[PDB]
Amino acid sequence: RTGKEEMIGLIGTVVEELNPEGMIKVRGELWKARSKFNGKIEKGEKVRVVDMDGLTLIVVRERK
Amino acid sequence: RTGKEEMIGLIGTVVEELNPEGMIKVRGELWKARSKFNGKIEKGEKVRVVDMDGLTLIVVRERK
Numbered sequence A, B: 001r002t003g004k005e006e007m008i009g010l011i012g013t014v015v016e017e018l019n020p021e022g023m024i025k026v027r028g029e030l031w032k033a034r035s036k037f038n039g040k041i042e043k044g045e046k047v048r049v050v051d052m053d054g055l056t057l058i059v060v061r062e063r064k
């Protein structure tokens, strides 16, 4: 398993809208992702990785 | 309660070494903080807020 320690804190870009679940690109890799609070994070938006649920990244939109 | 949504994703600076518990400054406020994985994050280091445990911020050191 690619651990939590490797992913948490990284920035990615939404490639498939998080509504609240979707798809993000982090480094070169595609990942399943879920926004922590927001109902919807749009394609192209920058997100921050804050946790991990199995192979699903939990993200908030990047601040400012 | 100042919710998780307000704090998660923000950057702060360690004001009292996280070993793993300590003190950080986020915005103008002093907060209790705990590093998520690391055994020790030093004074002056930049951290990212990834979660919250009561009034204690859970942080990783800022990437790159």
Ligand code: NA
Pocket: A020, A035, A036, A037, A038, A039
């Ligand atoms: Na949600």
Ligand code: NA
Pocket: B020, B035, B036, B037, B038, B039
């Ligand atoms: Na620990």
